[PDB]
Amino acid sequence: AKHLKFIARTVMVQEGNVESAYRTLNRILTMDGLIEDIKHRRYYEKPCRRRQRESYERCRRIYNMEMARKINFLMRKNRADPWQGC
Amino acid sequence: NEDLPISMENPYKEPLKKCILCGKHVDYKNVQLLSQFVSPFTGCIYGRHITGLCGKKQKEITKAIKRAQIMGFMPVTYKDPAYLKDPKVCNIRYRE
Amino acid sequence: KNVLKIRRRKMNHHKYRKLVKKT
Amino acid sequence: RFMEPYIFGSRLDHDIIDLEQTATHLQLALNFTAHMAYRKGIILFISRNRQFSYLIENMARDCGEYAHTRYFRGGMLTNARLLFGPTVRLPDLIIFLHT
Amino acid sequence: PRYELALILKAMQRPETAATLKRTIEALMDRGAIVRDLENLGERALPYRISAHSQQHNRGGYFLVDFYAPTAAVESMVEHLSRDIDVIRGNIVKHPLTQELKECEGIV
Amino acid sequence: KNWLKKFASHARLRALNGLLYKALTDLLCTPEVSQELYDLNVELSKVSLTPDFSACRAYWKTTLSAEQNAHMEAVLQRSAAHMRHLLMSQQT
Amino acid sequence: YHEDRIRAKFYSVYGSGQRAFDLFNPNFKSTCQRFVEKYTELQKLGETDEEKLFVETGKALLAEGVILRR
Amino acid sequence: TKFSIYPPIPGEESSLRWAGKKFEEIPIAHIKASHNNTQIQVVSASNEPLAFASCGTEGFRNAKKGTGIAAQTAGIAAAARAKQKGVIHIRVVVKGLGPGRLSAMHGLIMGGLEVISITDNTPIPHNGCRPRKARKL
Amino acid sequence: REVLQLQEEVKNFITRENLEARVEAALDSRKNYNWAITREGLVVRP
RNA sequence: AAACUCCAGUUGACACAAAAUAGACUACGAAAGUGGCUUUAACAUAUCUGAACACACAAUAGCUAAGACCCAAACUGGGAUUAGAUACCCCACUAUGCUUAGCCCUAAACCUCAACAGUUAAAUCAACAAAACUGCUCGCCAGAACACUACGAGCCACAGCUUAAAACUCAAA
Ligand code: FES
Ligand SMILES: [K+]
Ligand SMILES: [Mg+2]
Numbered sequence A: 001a002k003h004l005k006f007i008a009r010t011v012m013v014q015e016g017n018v019e020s021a022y023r024t025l026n027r028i029l030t031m032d033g034l035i036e037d038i039k040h041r042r043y044y045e046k047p048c049r050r051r052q053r054e055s056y057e058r059c060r061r062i063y064n065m066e067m068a069r070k071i072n073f074l075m076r077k078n079r080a081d082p083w084q085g086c
Numbered sequence B: 001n002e003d004l005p006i007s008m009e010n011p012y013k014e015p016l017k018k019c020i021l022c023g024k025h026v027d028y029k030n031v032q033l034l035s036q037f038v039s040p041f042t043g044c045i046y047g048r049h050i051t052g053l054c055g056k057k058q059k060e061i062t063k064a065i066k067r068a069q070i071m072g073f074m075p076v077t078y079k080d081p082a083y084l085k086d087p088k089v090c091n092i093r094y095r096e
Numbered sequence C: 001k002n003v004l005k006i007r008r009r010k011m012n013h014h015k016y017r018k019l020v021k022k023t
Numbered sequence D: 001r002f003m004e005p006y007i008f009g010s011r012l013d014h015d016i017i018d019l020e021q022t023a024t025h026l027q028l029a030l031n032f033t034a035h036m037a038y039r040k041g042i043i044l045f046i047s048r049n050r051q052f053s054y055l056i057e058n059m060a061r062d063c064g065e066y067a068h069t070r071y072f073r074g075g076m077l078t079n080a081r082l083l084f085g086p087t088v089r090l091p092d093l094i095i096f097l098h099t
Numbered sequence E: 001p002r003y004e005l006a007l008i009l010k011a012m013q014r015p016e017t018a019a020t021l022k023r024t025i026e027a028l029m030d031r032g033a034i035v036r037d038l039e040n041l042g043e044r045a046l047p048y049r050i051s052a053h054s055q056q057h058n059r060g061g062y063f064l065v066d067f068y069a070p071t072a073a074v075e076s077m078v079e080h081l082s083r084d085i086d087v088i089r090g091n092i093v094k095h096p097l098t099q100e101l102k103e104c105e106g107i108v
Numbered sequence F: 001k002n003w004l005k006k007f008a009s010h011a012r013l014r015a016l017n018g019l020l021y022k023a024l025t026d027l028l029c030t031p032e033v034s035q036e037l038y039d040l041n042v043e044l045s046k047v048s049l050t051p052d053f054s055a056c057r058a059y060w061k062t063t064l065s066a067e068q069n070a071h072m073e074a075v076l077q078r079s080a081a082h083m084r085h086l087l088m089s090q091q092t
Numbered sequence G: 001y002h003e004d005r006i007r008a009k010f011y012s013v014y015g016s017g018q019r020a021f022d023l024f025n026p027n028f029k030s031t032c033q034r035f036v037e038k039y040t041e042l043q044k045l046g047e048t049d050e051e052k053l054f055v056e057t058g059k060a061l062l063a064e065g066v067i068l069r070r
Numbered sequence H: 001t002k003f004s005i006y007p008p009i010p011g012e013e014s015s016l017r018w019a020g021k022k023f024e025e026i027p028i029a030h031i032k033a034s035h036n037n038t039q040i041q042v043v044s045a046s047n048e049p050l051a052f053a054s055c056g057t058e059g060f061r062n063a064k065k066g067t068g069i070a071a072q073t074a075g076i077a078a079a080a081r082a083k084q085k086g087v088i089h090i091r092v093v094v095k096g097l098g099p100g101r102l103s104a105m106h107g108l109i110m111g112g113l114e115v116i117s118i119t120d121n122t123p124i125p126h127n128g129c130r131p132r133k134a135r136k137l
Numbered sequence I: 001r002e003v004l005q006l007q008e009e010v011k012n013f014i015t016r017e018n019l020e021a022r023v024e025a026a027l028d029s030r031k032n033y034n035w036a037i038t039r040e041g042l043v044v045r046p
Numbered sequence J: 001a002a003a004c005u006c007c008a009g010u011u012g013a014c015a016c017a018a019a020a021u022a023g024a025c026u027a028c029g030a031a032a033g034u035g036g037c038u039u040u041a042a043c044a045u046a047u048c049u050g051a052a053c054a055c056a057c058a059a060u061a062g063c064u065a066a067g068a069c070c071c072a073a074a075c076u077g078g079g080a081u082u083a084g085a086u087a088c089c090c091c092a093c094u095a096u097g098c099u100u101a102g103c104c105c106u107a108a109a110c111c112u113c114a115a116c117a118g119u120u121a122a123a124u125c126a127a128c129a130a131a132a133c134u135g136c137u138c139g140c141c142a143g144a145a146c147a148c149u150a151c152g153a154g155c156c157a158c159a160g161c162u163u164a165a166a167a168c169u170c171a172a173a
């Protein structure tokens, strides 16, 4: 309200590609967490539910990264069998 | 026997990794530095997974940013356009 | 855990609060 | 853990096996194997390392002994009578090149 | 202790700015302060529009006053900075140099 | 709560269908789920809840190309759980 | 081992030798190993100043004709 | 010259011109995309209202207002009423995440106006007013 | 050492006598605290 | 459908409310709790244990006085649905959530792990939870239900809180 306008969350259109500018703006707002914040602020989330959700997402991310690391580490052995037959 | 191994700290121990701001002072008046860790479009403070800073310097940067914002040194809703052409130190790409 | 015991505690307490209200 | 007494040390996070102990252990094992072969006992080599299955089978055939480098089915030793016959003779010595 | 006063003053001409700075430093000294040095950071556009003393400001002069004052002075100075009409925004902080630069061995 | 261990181990129906259809369309309007899904521009025809509320079937319009249809199916099947999580997190 | 310290400093100053290691040879001599042997000989035939030993060992190896790029 | 997504700064002079006018002189189309209705208002750089159109002013009623077609029609009507006042280039400022967020701009483009920049100004409190309770449907 | 450093530093402090001149000089000066950091950890001074 | 149309959009001024992002951090505090900025005070003890009652504290809810009131909202109305709706959905609005001075003293107040010190050796070990134990101290427990009850006592509490039985009954729980 007290800030200068047309600086925040603003994307310029290149060669009349308005759809591309909109999709870039959507990507920016989603990456900065603004979209999920707006969607979550429509109704009040109770503090206990918020803490449970944050813990769940944190542990989900940790577990997913660890499983991805394990799969990538064990993917090296997936080559042609060098001792076929024996 | 002279060839037996001797007790010793690892001489090949590599120096422990450092963050880009380690050993440097973070001041709330240095808006140019604090602007390198905020989103150009929203002014939101980047997390450590993007900035790559350590916990101590991440906290220092956060506190300095809040102090500068509330004391009338830094904008809140966007990054100052004067610092848009500064070196990029954050691991984030909008394909923009 | 005993959910019957907690449900028994709930029924006993609720019945008690009805009695004090009545009398 | 049980391999610790046989480890000379760790060289840049790589364990080194004390070869002085290995010499005595190998001496005892080879003496036992030679004595068992002298008594005409059945000797069975076992190893699931497919890189050396051919070599171990060739060696077993060469020395007139037996080899099992393939998938080990349930009960080959503890149920040998049902799997080979009521009068089968089991090995008198088993040598694991890979345990 | 040692304090730094960050002062955002109204965008005025040189005489009024000098008078305001003199008045601020004089108040500091009256409250028992020993002023070490005065820095000028420049006249610049504010990060946002600031409403003070029934006036809207988009531009302002930034100044730093380093000083040594007793602990009881700071509160009083704040109240004084609240009454000065030529001050858009005054904030007293503990001097950053007094804060110790603890050394780090790196990411554990 | 040791998430490590857990991870390792009718008029009402029509209203709920409409609400879920709107919510799923809004979710697909953005990269909130994933950028790969957003680039596909998936469109939904309807949402049907089973009579016993054991499953939610979202009918998505297919395109003419078959490779694109297969890619869309793969991405949607890989994204379904994340959309469920988002729907409950937003308190829809 | 003691020489490991020297090796570390060598591997930190002159870096890894452009010459490749031949681990099949039981008596392979790397540039770092020759530096170590010269360092120990100098220590046994002189004083104990770690920096001076390093610099004089470098001078001696360059005199022999072994390239050493810092 | 490399294209810059970042809008020109009024202070810093730039060469970007649209029909001879600078960035800060272009009219602004304010779109409010609510959950059940969409509003479009075109204003000048000095905040002089030139055109206004919503889904309700174009005849749509009740749930028909909260659709893409209604927002497109409102955008077309606003574009027509703005072209009748000399508007060609516009800067779009969208507010809200309603169904008419993109359809209103589609209508504006289809009505003859050229979009030079898109801005989002959806109200995001830094945790101010407490929102209503979740529905128990 | 600290006391001597403080004693020599006090010579440049602002007093009631030099307030006019020091205010004027500060008004005719500009201090800059801005500096950027690079990915290599180097300071880029403006 | 009701409701509003002193309505709605842009712009400008404008809180005794709440404190995006940072936080993918795991810190402070005895616990309860604590996540906008500045400043002043300030986080006990160089043996350990030591209380339903002593001395201090204790989320949310609740009771007295005054004040503030954006938003939310038990309750209360209106609209809709339904066989009915004294609920769920929509609108409006209270007590209350806020400040000040007093009370009330309860929570799945839980890491469902009492405080200090020590060990990783034994068959590790009913099971599950959260690897198994040792020394020392305080508190507590001896079938289920009756019973977070009755009576007595204490309490700023008066449909309240703490402590807390017995009779009858059963072979289980
Ligand atoms: S790594 Fe040392 S201060 Fe961050
Ligand atoms: K718990
Ligand atoms: Mg004690």
Ligand SMILES: [Mg+2]
Binding pocket: none
């Ligand atoms: Mg007692």
Ligand SMILES: [Mg+2]
Binding pocket: none
């Ligand atoms: Mg209380």
Ligand SMILES: [Mg+2]
Binding pocket: none
């Ligand atoms: Mg209260």
Ligand SMILES: [Mg+2]
Binding pocket: none
């Ligand atoms: Mg708790």
Ligand SMILES: [Mg+2]
Binding pocket: J114, J115, J138
């Ligand atoms: Mg105790």
Ligand SMILES: [Mg+2]
Binding pocket: J139
């Ligand atoms: Mg006790």
Ligand SMILES: [Mg+2]
Binding pocket: none
């Ligand atoms: Mg009993």
Ligand SMILES: [Mg+2]
Binding pocket: none
């Ligand atoms: Mg009682």
